Design a protein around this ligand. Structure first.
Ligand SMILES: O=C(COP(=O)(O)O)[C@@H](O)[C@H](O)[C@H](O)COP(=O)(O)O
Ligand SMILES: O=C(COP(=O)(O)O)[C@@H](O)[C@H](O)[C@H](O)COP(=O)(O)O
Ligand SMILES: O=C(COP(=O)(O)O)[C@@H](O)[C@H](O)[C@H](O)COP(=O)(O)O
Ligand SMILES: O=C(COP(=O)(O)O)[C@@H](O)[C@H](O)[C@H](O)COP(=O)(O)O
Ligand SMILES: O=C(COP(=O)(O)O)[C@@H](O)[C@H](O)[C@H](O)COP(=O)(O)O
Ligand SMILES: [Mg+2]
Ligand SMILES: [Mg+2]
Ligand SMILES: [Mg+2]
Ligand SMILES: [Mg+2]
Ligand SMILES: [Mg+2]
Ligand SMILES: [Mg+2]
Ligand SMILES: [Mg+2]
Ligand SMILES: [Mg+2]
Ligand SMILES: [Mg+2]
Ligand SMILES: [Mg+2]
Ligand SMILES: [Mg+2]
Ligand SMILES: [Mg+2]
Ligand SMILES: [Mg+2]
Ligand SMILES: [Mg+2]
Ligand SMILES: [Mg+2]
Ligand SMILES: [Mg+2]
Ligand SMILES: [Mg+2]
Ligand SMILES: [Mg+2]
Ligand SMILES: [Mg+2]
Ligand SMILES: [Mg+2]
Lengths: 359, 359, 359, 359, 359
């Protein structure tokens, strides 16, 4: 029984909400190195995507474990202290509600965890994104596990003919429903087509209920606000989507909510580790993909999945679409709908014009 | 005192919500020919864009005139009768609530009217669109009358330095506010950036309050539903935007709400009269632009504005963007937000899954 | 009760298997004009696509009617006589087994027929192609009636939520199976993905079994040979795919079997009536689409569906892909698999090299 | 007398059928280092392409030598043991019939060998590919040795005017025929145009029967299955194709069988060593090319042939074509013909629908 | 109270006005290392863009400090001495009026300085350009601080609704005016649209007069000549433009004056540090952008802002536009207007043709 835990948080960044400073990751490493030595975790890999510090850990303490999460929290705290000493922007952003930044602060780390029984070989792909929200994975997951034009295994691999089912979470009501594909795909799409309300949290294979994927998503809180910059774990091969079928689902840089000030739609841009930073208009939204093999709680890898020429046109299209969207300025659909904007002056404007509006 | 009235309505179309059949326009012509002979109207031009029959009329009976509107209604009725006899699809669509079609029916004709005092020369541009809504003109109008990067006259023509003001209608509350540019552009944009709620209905020059533009838009009704496929009249030159500045505002094929089943965002495609028909995915949304000179109530013209090579790249970009958007399938932002979809199965789906949703 | 019958045949063409000569269609018109006068048929429209003369007829004699088919045969015979007198190439090609041409001759006319009860309004799209086979419509039909990324109505139109079922014909065994979507789409695709063996012949709406589409396809004959250059009739709107959803299925110029010497894969190119002729490499395969409204057995229209700018990029991509495929020369996958080639020298080659092959 | 032996095998890979892990190659190196020390082989170079570990060895033990092959087998075994300890996917794939993977396992290493008499200078190019089959080299070889539009030497170099002959193997019958170019090129093409049945195994210069090229291909076995991911050795210059003429044959990224689940056609993408890994849709198929000079059994080099800007457009075209092919989903010609698919559910589907098929 | 001082100067370059030689920067480093040790400055970063050596220094001695500037001068002097010993071109260019070069020499170092009170976190972006003049920043700054289509914060961030004001310097008259946005943007643009006469020197936030940006620009001198190759400091976040909004203003490679012989208009090309050198036609003009965080007088960073894929299309467009402009040869608008050309032969030509000109 092995648990793969991907916990991330924004603890500050250089020159804006741009990139995680190496020194902060070094601080996080000392903490996890100790946790590994103490036997709390079996292995780990630390990296970043944009201004989000990523903690990939394997252990045998199951999902939602207090000690693993506390270990992650201490890692972020130590990283935040370095960020503060370095005077980085938004130091401790996701940890302190009063940190120095203008976006939603102090919501805590985002998490994607799956406790599983390692198969003979356990290949997995971990995706981490910056400048977007959990619903960003709805389209990719649907394609990976239900679209026969994306995953031919559904049609030509006997072991996958049974299909997969999706656990869809209503982030507002805090309730989840299980929909099976293929016969409920029209129902499924009617829901997940609205990423701000319905998000795929987990995916299971129909034939044996094997857990195949998990997304970092939790119901909204009224302070309605929720965490962003999602992570996802996808189990691959042998009856589950091949690495290539999972990657095929990201070949199209679809428009996702987020980007600048968490108030726009922009193309998801799959990038290499070195290109995992937010620049133009605080983006475009960046997607990092790392492949691993989990062996007895150990992390073999990673292999940088999108750092390959097969995604060069995906990135070029992302840049072209980014320019096109930007020519819309503050107009929908480039700007998000009123209630979904992380930043807004509408309430203040209407207040100022209350007596100027005529019947 | 001359009134320019553009009244349009869908009275049926060939092979779907594709194109207005010539025979139906011929019927409408007989009616307006009689009205002109009777002196009700001074002149007129009939055409179409997609499945919307357009009645461009000039007269001296002012805005919201019962006889002019009744004349228009009779023209549409006669056209609808021919559509019915020809077995066209959605015959009498906008006139009968029970016409044969699946979209919103019987809401009545859309109207854009402006009563003015003809200047020495009165050049105007009339824009008519199919497969989108009134808010589609928000971005173009803002550019035409407030964006110095679109209309250099605002910066280099002394007669335009004073700027323009916009009458913005809250289509839900049924109230309008006047915002002046330049000093209130940030306030203006905070509103019109949401085309489904705030729509520019009229534009005036600040220095003398001269009416410069009018858009077909009326507050929503609860049956919240409203008319679509908008028309707009823009007065040009001599202190008002040049024809070229008005056309510059459409050089960028921005994403507008509508397209297939009035439930998607798609690029507005400026087209010639011959290309004014909906095809791929019932679009892309089509924009027809006609230039005229109004002289003593007479309509000199028209000149097909977008039927020119200067817009060939605009159309190519529209086709490229159309393909890109379509790869999103039933997912936002290609699909509209839940409450804005003209068609939806969500209510029925949630009802069906009410007991399957778990807390 | 109205029957729409599309019957086509190659009766000769100018300068090769290039285009139908106007004089031959004039001869066919005299025959149908008489049939209409005699009351055999209620209406008709004659045209062509490549070297295939098209007879679109509406009547009340049901499917597979001897008199209607005999009328069609006489129309083709008269056209063939003119073709012969004009010395056209392959005169009487599909009517005479010994006509002057090197391809498969004398198989008879291809047919697509559907007897229906006209709805309040009966909009339809008729597709006719040259230089390909019936299976060419498998991908488009699957998209039109089962792919939610093509036809959003399946997801957002309550009247279509029930889905559609496909009658798939095994052209070799002469047996057909009914598969329903959505829950059998993986099974369906496993079959129709092989257009040379499994072809969608008809499509029905699940909720009420309404016939929605028909394709010209008949089981193979051993002389295993079958007819090519297929036609298809698709009923549109009001619970059935919108014209735009049917056209969306052809926005992608997919590779289809046929083209030069019926032995290659080439992109299906949607074209206007004037561009419906085979040129480069006897293609690329051409697709003509005509929209009509059927009213009391009468044909209102047609409207040339693909003669629109929304398909300009589709055609450009077809040309680009055509060049790419051609660089493969006589190699698969540009050349068809051995048993599917209409022309082949393999048997003769192996015979010549029987003693040169060493164990 | 020197023998160049290229022996490759899949012994496991990281995160899927993605890439060979460095540790496994290190294990293989220890084995060959010992073999070299023992005098079994004179020199070697180890690398990979996708999930295939490559052993390039030079020795004086001739073709099909038991000790050289046994040495290769031990190298793979040691690599497989490391792969197993690292928990890599498909550990020992090509060595064990029951290894953990869903594709064809335990068929053994693929081999391309040529025993020759070194010329004054012996320049050679070695090509290794992943995600395709031996027939993939048919088109390139034909161009290199018979197409005057590829190799001008055939027309302007007196020493090459005599031409070359091809040993074509019928992989099903297990028999080979020798065809000479130029006078038998139409016969040759009639055969090699079908890569799944006829594969060029060796190429000889007509004038002196000098062996010029060898491809890894063996007759099929009934367990009809065969090995994939082919290698090829081509001798260059001085009467044989120049390095540039051999590379010219790969400038066009032709469609080859394989890619995802060995059941699709995809463009062959020539890549540098660092880009020799399978990603999008488990590809596109990757081609590694290494140039060497063989001097007294020693391997001087290599030079990474495709890691050069002259192939940047080749790769871009491969990416563009890859996207185009993928839009076909599970449909031919993107999906392979029924009998050529490595994975299939057809047998099971027909069994399930046996009673639903109607006569 | 911390002062950020960016002082640059051309002290010689390799192979032309191409690039700063590393040895010269090493000499400059020794000088600043000493100044830091002596406490004159708190921190520094030295780099280059084209042939301009950049000295980024932080200290507490305020703007226009004699000792800081003298320190900079000594740094340049030591660098110039190395340049001279290395025989570099234009050694001491900006320091000596008689240095070996044909352009304007001995004008002295260019400077951009801002004394501020560090905010909780002080993220900044420093831009340095070669082959253009100060006015090059007019368009970018206008967009960053006044264009709602560039900086959505102006519309959706309450803390920025108040807008910004610009200090515009008349470089000829030596007088500056303060214009506020939004209500004076048309006036502002009427001026800054002429970069050779009106240059934005500083930018302030309207609500609290916080200094947000500074540009290196000084009034012209009659020897009318002025310095070129400008630098700019922009304060970011928390009520000021986000890093992404500042970078968005450079996404469009606008035409700027300078390039070859300071007499042409060419596209501003944002580049990485390694690409910060002038090549084709002594350009195109290069823009280096570095992000830092200032903490207690210390410089944390930098992060190379434009060395990211999000600007790849910006650079490609720059190359395309560069070629287009170059086809104009010595004709305006590629060549600058007569009085703005750094090099000219016009005076001599007119003198030579004085008697050949006929009335
Ligand atoms: O979305 C963003 C960062 O979100 P995270 O990636 O940190 O969640 C950015 O776009 C910020 O909203 C923008 O820089 C303004 O930040 P602020 O000046 O108000 O502090
Ligand atoms: O938006 C459209 C027409 O709107 P209008 O242009 O007529 O306003 C079309 O996209 C229709 O919604 C679609 O054809 C379905 O029509 P229906 O089969 O349900 O009757
Ligand atoms: O496929 C074709 C026509 O098929 P149809 O469109 O007529 O069915 C063409 O490509 C012909 O095979 C080719 O011109 C050779 O015709 P042939 O010289 O041997 O007579
Ligand atoms: O062709 C492939 C590898 O072939 P080789 O390169 O290993 O020969 C891949 O495309 C695999 O078929 C696919 O990942 C599924 O592997 P599986 O989950 O069933 O184990
Ligand atoms: O603008 C330039 C350098 O300006 P700076 O970047 O040095 O200011 C270059 O384009 C020079 O004018 C050109 O090389 C001629 O230099 P010169 O042979 O007459 O010495
Ligand atoms: Mg942040
Ligand atoms: Mg983030
Ligand atoms: Mg955020
Ligand atoms: Mg975040
Ligand atoms: Mg309609
Ligand atoms: Mg309409
Ligand atoms: Mg509508
Ligand atoms: Mg309408
Ligand atoms: Mg023919
Ligand atoms: Mg034909
Ligand atoms: Mg044929
Ligand atoms: Mg035919
Ligand atoms: Mg493998
Ligand atoms: Mg392989
Ligand atoms: Mg394989
Ligand atoms: Mg293999
Ligand atoms: Mg210089
Ligand atoms: Mg310079
Ligand atoms: Mg200069
Ligand atoms: Mg200079």
């Amino acid at each position: 029984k092995t648990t793969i835990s991907v916990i991330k948080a924004d603890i500050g960044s250089l020159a804006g909400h741009h990139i995680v400073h190496p020194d902060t990751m070094a601080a996080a490493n000392k903490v996890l190195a100790s946790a590994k030595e103490q036997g709390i975790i079996l292995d780990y890999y630390i990296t970043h995507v944009g201004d989000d510090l990523q903690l990939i850990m394997t252990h045998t303490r199951g999902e939602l474990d207090t000690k693993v999460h506390e270990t992650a929290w201490n890692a972020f705290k130590e990283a935040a202290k370095v960020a503060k000493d370095l005077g980085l922007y938004a130091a401790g952003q996701d940890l302190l509600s009063d940190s120095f930044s203008g976006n939603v602060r102090g919501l805590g780390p985002g998490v994607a965890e799956m406790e599983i029984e390692e198969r003979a070989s356990e290949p997995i792909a971990i995706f981490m994104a910056d400048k977007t929200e959990p619903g960003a994975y709805n389209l990719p997951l649907y394609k990976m596990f239900a679209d026969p034009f994306n995953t031919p295994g559904l049609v030509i691999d006997p072991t996958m003919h049974g299909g997969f089912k999706f656990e869809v979470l209503d982030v507002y009501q805090g309730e989840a429903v299980m929909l099976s594909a293929p016969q409920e795909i029209y129902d499924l799409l009617a829901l997940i087509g609205t990423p701000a309300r319905y998000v795929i949290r987990r995916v299971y294979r129909n034939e044996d209920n094997l857990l195949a994927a998990v997304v970092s998503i939790e119901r909204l809180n009224l302070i309605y606000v929720g965490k962003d910059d999602p992570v996802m774990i996808v189990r691959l091969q042998h009856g589950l989507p091949a690495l290539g079928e999972a990657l095929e689902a990201f070949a199209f840089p679809h428009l996702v909510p987020g980007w600048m000030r968490g108030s726009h739609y922009g193309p998801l841009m799959p990038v290499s580790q070195r290109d995992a930073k937010a620049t133009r208009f605080d983006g475009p939204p960046r997607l990092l993909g790392l492949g691993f093999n989990v062996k007895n709680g150990r992390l073999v890898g990673p292999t940088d999945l999108f750092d390959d020429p097969a995604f060069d046109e995906t990135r070029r299209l992302a840049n072209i679409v980014a320019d096109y969207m930007r020519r819309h300025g503050p107009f929908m659909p480039h700007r998000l709908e009123p209630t979904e904007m992380e930043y807004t002056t509408l309430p203040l404007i209407l207040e100022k014009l209350k007596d100027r509006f005529k019947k």
